[PDB]
Amino acid sequence: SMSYTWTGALITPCAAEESKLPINALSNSLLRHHNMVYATTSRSAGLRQKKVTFDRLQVLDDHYRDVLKEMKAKASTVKAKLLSVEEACKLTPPHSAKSKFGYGAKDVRNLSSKAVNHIHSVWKDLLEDTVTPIDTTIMAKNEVFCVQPEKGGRKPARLIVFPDLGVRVCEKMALYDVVSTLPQVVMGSSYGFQYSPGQRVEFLVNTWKSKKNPMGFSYDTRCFDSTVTENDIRVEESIYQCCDLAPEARQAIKSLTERLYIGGPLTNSKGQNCGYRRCRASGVLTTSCGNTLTCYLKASAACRAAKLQDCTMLVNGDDLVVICESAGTQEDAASLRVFTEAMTRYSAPPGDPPQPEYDLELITSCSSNVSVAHDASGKRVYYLTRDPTTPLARAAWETARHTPVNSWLGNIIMYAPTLWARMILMTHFFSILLAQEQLEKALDCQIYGACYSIEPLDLPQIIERLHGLSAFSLHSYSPGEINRVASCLRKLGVPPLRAWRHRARNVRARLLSRGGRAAICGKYLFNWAVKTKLKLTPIADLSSWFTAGYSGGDIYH
């Protein structure tokens, strides 16, 4: 069926939309080519609609059924429970989109009588009606990027589809525990959200070394959400139903699946009917879990169809990487086309066709790649990195304009061992925090889709816990990594690394002259900036951060 059907009504904005990076002294000192940084807006929604709208002609085979069978067997061993209205309300982000029935995220978190009553009535409607399509709002996402001349154009805005706040609270009650525990059980080590960046690198390296003649590849599905069929979503529901669940959950899950997940009417911000959706909604609680399960199911089946030897996959939503035994270059090339053919039959054709890679560092998955550096003793240390273009463009944007989400802080946390996060992001932001006396100001940042409130002075502790002490001592980075960073800086007009060193020395001294954690930040985060290095001893439970994915799931921790 068609992923979407449009009426003609436009996807409209609910507020003023900034698209250009304003000229600001603070952001200018980080990146000069401001004209290269932009934010997508509803003005390009039409271009995105055209791409995400198409007919899916899914054909399933024995490989697919066999894998599905094994997945259900593992799901049957999982026991999940309903969340109380209180527990679901507590997971609601402080600034989540307010309901259209006269109450908001604030009312929900505070458990206002009006919020709790509407929630109760929505829940009861789910149990009493498992057919009537639930309404959803379609909006254009505003995200920041850097222009890519070679691409031939700017990126169109992504579309987000989400139901009313009351429905979202009910999703949590019926499914938060399921999406939070089921995937790792069904997928095992292949479930990518159970890993911190370091654990991810460890799994990738160990897996790579476990092959006699390693070969790996990432598979990029073109418009994954749109390729997800009504059958995929119902198969996904059957996997959830294999769990040990309370009658109410079972009923609410069937209802949400039939009324929301498999499709429904699309309404713009003006209240007009934009059309109908018959694919995955980007903005529901099950998006990440459903996508991961679906990608895994299809990729696993396609691995068997292609007869790939000793395969090992790592899946994060639609992000997929496969490492296996090579059979020669020509044979690997033929095997990948077979893999692609199967994925296509399963309704998941490629954006870019997959390419066999024989060097681990050259495999980009989930926009990242493993690279190597050395600690103080000269020992090899593998770590996760990525091209810094987007992180830098977003850092500049967030420096000029106050934003609810601080992607720069998530980037420092996730890519703390990288030379770019250390020399540029840490330096630039601590300099600003010092200037504004906001070192103790807590900030919101997304990690695996979930929202966390983090204090920047806690960075040293967070980084040590997540990456170990080596994150503060890495040096002698690879030639490839060094060149990518250097190239990115010239393109964006970002000052050279040597200039950042000078800035860091100044920032470092200022933090050391201050109290508590500020001195620890100066000592640990900027030890790389001084020749006479201090002794980095262990600093005198972030497990919940890397347990499951929640992208588009309206989760606040």
Ligand SMILES: *[C@H](c1ccc(Br)cc1)[C@H]1SC(=S)N(NS(=O)(=O)c2ccccc2)C1=O
């Ligand atoms: C790809 C991804 C990148 C790094 C890792 Br360790 C896992 C997966 C996608 S999946 C996802 S959700 N995110 N957002 S994140 O919150 O994991 C994040 C934020 C900032 C830097 C890196 C990762 C991805 O990036």
